[PDB]
């Protein structure tokens, strides 16, 4: 969509891989400002919000946490305390007609700065004075939208660039979109250090014959000592025993 109509989308009830983003070297910029980008897929957030648009070459640096500017003042207000990430890549191959791609419009003049994370499409020809600008433009009446002139002859400062911004939240309600994790191969008959679904321990784990109700995971004892465990990937029953200790 255009700059003035930057679409705002939310994502919920999934697992966000982020793997394609970190190895993304064909796209020019993947810059996360709020948190370290590489160590993000290993953490969780309640929601993630994506705002997508195609902007100027100069405006690429303008949409940043705390960074202001023309589009950053009139078309996209990013708050100072914004923790998020920005993805940007040149799209002059598609977003440039031979005669000029004029599907993209931007407003640059509004009498009052827009609130953060708000989309406003008031297309009234700006009324500067007390005269009514009801389709009458010029002095004290400004035509509200300028079309993006996207041509190959335009400089790097005025080139089309596809840019999306991601905002991460973890809120009082329990989160949904946590990051994917990796499961190592199973090991039997050795005092290893095991971690099943947050439960942690050290011991030797062997095959079992205990029968579990189809909804149960753990298995414990009289004195609050975990004894059996159900394997989370494929379903089995494994007893655990602390590896041998004694007196010499």
């Amino acid at each position, epitope marked *: *969509a255009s700059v003035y*109509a930057w*679409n*705002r989308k939310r994502i919920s009830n999934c697992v966000a891989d982020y793997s394609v983003l970190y190895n993304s070297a064909s796209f020019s910029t993947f810059k996360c400002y709020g948190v370290s980008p590489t160590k993000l897929n290993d953490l969780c957030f309640t929601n993630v919000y994506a705002d*997508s648009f195609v902007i100027r070459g100069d405006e690429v640096r303008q949409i940043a946490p705390g960074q202001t500017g023309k589009i950053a003042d009139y078309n996209y207000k990013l708050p100072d305390d914004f923790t998020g990430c920005v993805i940007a890549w040149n799209s002059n191959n598609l977003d440039s007609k031979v005669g000029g791609n004029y599907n993209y419009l931007y407003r640059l003049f509004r009498k009052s700065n827009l609130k953060p994370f708000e989309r406003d*499409i008031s297309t009234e020809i700006y009324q500067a004075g007390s005269t009514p600008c*009801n389709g009458v433009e010029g002095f004290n009446c400004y035509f509200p939208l300028q079309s993006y002139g996207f041509q190959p002859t335009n400089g790097v400062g005025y080139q089309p660039y596809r840019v999306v911004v991601l905002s991460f939240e973890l809120l009082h309600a329990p989160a949904t979109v946590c990051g994917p994790k990796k499961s190592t191969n199973l090991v039997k008959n050795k005092c290893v250090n095991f971690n099943f679904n947050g439960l942690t321990g050290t011991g030797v784990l062997t095959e079992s014959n205990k029968k579990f109700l189809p909804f149960q995971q753990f298995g414990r004892d009289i004195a609050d000592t975990t004894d059996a465990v159900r394997d989370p990937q494929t379903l089995e029953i494994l007893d655990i025993t602390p590896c041998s200790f004694g007196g010499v």
Partner: antibody
Framework: QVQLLESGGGLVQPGRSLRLSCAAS????????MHWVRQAPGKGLEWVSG????????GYADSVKGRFTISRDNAKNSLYLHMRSLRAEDTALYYC????????????????????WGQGTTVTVSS | DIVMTQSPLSLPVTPGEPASISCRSS???????????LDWYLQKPGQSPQLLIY???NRASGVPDRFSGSGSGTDFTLKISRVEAEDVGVYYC?????????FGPGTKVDIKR
């Protein structure tokens, strides 16, 4: 039930603006591309404008390039169509239409196939 | 800028012969991926507009299977072999490739006498 509420009726003189609003009921706004098709009497249907499921404007018509504008409202499930500096030669009946194709139907984005039409209004571009 | 045409404008049909109207385009409508991007539209006089056919060969829901928009490149023909009494209507063919999107002339098939 899928109900199309079209608002913005009234009389407009050439040289001024216009604004129509589309409201949809019975289905999710974001899943389908929304198009505008007009049809003057004694002539068939003709595409006038459109916008994809991603609220991406598709362009402007050959006859009226530079003055029409189209926008979506995914927050309130609404749609705006604004007519900048109309002329008496633009007089016709406007029509709002919805797509069909379910999201991620595989190899381009599903944005075509208008199916459902209500009715427009009494747009008369005369002074 | 992209002209699509229908022919003939109106032909009178009776049960016993197919209803066949040809659409002529300016673009190659058989896309180079095994898929076509030409759609077909119906208008019943006195009722809200309808579709005919998805992408030339995909069959729409709510419509009879006798609708067939077939051909190649720019040459297509809408053929209905079996027509029931209420199939009096206006017809369009519409391209799904680029802008401006073109609707063909709306051909009126009415009652022959």
């Amino acid at each position: 039930q899928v109900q199309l509420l079209e608002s913005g009726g009234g009389l407009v003189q050439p040289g001024r603006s216009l604004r129509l609003s589309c409201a949809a009921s019975g289905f999710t706004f974001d899943d389908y591309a929304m198009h505008w098709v007009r049809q003057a009497p004694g002539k068939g249907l003709e595409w006038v404008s459109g916008v994809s499921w991603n609220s991406g404007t598709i362009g402007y018509a050959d006859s009226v390039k530079g003055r029409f504008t189209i926008s979506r409202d995914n927050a309130k499930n609404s749609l705006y169509l604004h007519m900048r500096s109309l002329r008496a030669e633009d007089t016709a009946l406007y029509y709002c239409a919805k797509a069909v194709e379910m999201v991620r139907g595989l190899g381009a984005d599903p944005e075509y196939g208008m199916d459902v039409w209500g009715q427009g209004t009494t747009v008369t571009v005369s002074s | 800028d992209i002209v699509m045409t229908q022919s003939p404008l109106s032909l009178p049909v009776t049960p016993g012969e197919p209803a066949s109207i040809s659409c002529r385009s300016s673009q190659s409508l058989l896309h180079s991926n095994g898929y076509n991007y030409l759609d077909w539209y119906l208008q019943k006089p006195g009722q809200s507009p309808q579709l005919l056919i998805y992408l030339g060969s995909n069959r729409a829901s709510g419509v009879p299977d006798r609708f067939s928009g077939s051909g190649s490149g720019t040459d297509f023909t809408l053929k209905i072999s079996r027509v029931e009494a209420e199939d009096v209507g206006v017809y369009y063919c519409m391209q799904a490739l680029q802008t401006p999107f073109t609707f063909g002339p709306g051909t009126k098939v009415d009652i022959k006498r």
